[PDB]
Amino acid sequence: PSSLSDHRPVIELPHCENSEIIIRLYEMPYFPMGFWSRLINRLLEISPYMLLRPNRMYWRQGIYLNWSPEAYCLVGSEVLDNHPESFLKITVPSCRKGCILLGQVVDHIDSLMEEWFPGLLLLKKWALYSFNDGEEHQKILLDDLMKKAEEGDLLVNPDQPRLTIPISQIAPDLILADLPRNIMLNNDELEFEQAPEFLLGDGSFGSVYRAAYEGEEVAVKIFNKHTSLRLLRQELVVLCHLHHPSLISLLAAGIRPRMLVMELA
């Protein structure tokens, strides 16, 4: 109900320690009233089962949702002392179900950034993290995190190498661990040469080649430095629940190469 105030109820949560949760921040000074009405309309679509209608508590500029002690998802606006630039904050527990809830939410937020703010892409994406429970969190610009995601290593403290953090915890929606089990790319089965002899076609995202995934010729979409990672999962969203004999099915994704594997015949 849009008639509600921006009240934020004192709800005791599970997963109170820093390592118990995932925190994603979206910075922008102001999100023109109506933004959160559109946001909640798209937030009231979240359901990890699709890959239950819990005691959600709408906060006008965000929502509680609740889900379960095991997996929950809080989304809403925030502001800090001496930090007038407002921001969105997402809190899910550090687990796959939380990752799923997060992944669906961040896609809804970005689709809103495309919808409510066409062409704006402000909207700074930060991974909030800590090397020790009870300590102060630090922020990673996801652009730099993606530079490190390419490496596939942990966040390594250069001054104290003894402190390292899994990138997948830092940003669960960066590495596709929340996919339906049947489409996680088996890197030991994707016999993809990437040579011109395998070229089938192309597109704005990059190029289409062929590969012997699990011994079968499949089509492969290489997101060749044309907004990779992002477009890849957005396509996966379209592919999810897309089931018809006349259509090209998904034969596993592949976030590490940014190469979607599709039906070829």
The tokens describing 180, both together, are 């339906």
Q: Is 254 annotated as a binding residue?
A: no
Taking the least distance from each CB to a second copy, the nearer of 25 and 154 is 154
CA-to-CA distance for 48 and 119, rounded, in angstroms? 30
Q: Indicate whether 25 belongs to the interface with a second copy (CB under 8 A).
A: no
Minimum Å gap between C-beta 169 and a second copy is 4
- HEC string of the chain equals CCCCCCCCCCCCCCCCCHHHEEEEEEECCCCCCCHHHHHHHHHCCCCHHHCCCCCCCECCCEECCCCCCCCCCEEEEEEECCEEEEEEEEEEECCHHHHHHHHHHHHHHHHHHHHCCCCCCCCEEEEEECCCCCCCCEEEEHHHHHHHHHHCCCEECCCCCCCEECHHHHCCCCCCCCCCHHHCCCCCCEECCCCHHHEEEEECCEEEEEEEECCEEEEEEEECCCCCCHHHHHHHHHHCCCCCCCCCCECCCCCCCCEEEEECC
Give whichever of 60 and 97 is closer to a second copy, judged by the CB atom: 97
Least separation in angstroms between CB 138 and a second copy: 18
57 is an annotated ligand-binding site residue: no
130 binding a second copy? (CB under 8 A): no
Map the footprint of a second copy across residues 56-75, applying CB under 8 A.
Answer: 69-70
Q: Tell me the chain's radius of gyration from C-alpha atoms.
A: 20
Which position among 34, 54, 166, 203 is part of the footprint of a second copy (CB under 8 A)? 166
Nearest approach in angstroms of CB 258 to a second copy is 16
Answer yes or no whether residue 156 interacts with a second copy by CB under 8 A: yes
Q: Using the rule CB under 8 A, which residue among 162, 225, 243, 244 binds a second copy?
A: 162
Q: Which is nearer to a second copy, 40 or 175 (CB)?
A: 175
> Is 95 one of the binding residues for a second copy (CB under 8 A)?
yes
Residue type, 173: D
Stretch 173-232 residues interacting with a second copy (CB under 8 A): 175, 177, 181, 184, 186-188
Minimum distance, C-beta of residue 58 to a second copy, in the bound complex (Å): 24
* Residues that constitute the known binding site for ATP: 200, 202-203, 206, 208, 219, 221, 262-263, 265
Q: Which residues bind a second copy (CB under 8 A)?
A: 13-17, 19-20, 69-70, 94-96, 99, 153-154, 156, 161-162, 164, 166-169, 172, 175, 177, 181, 184, 186-188
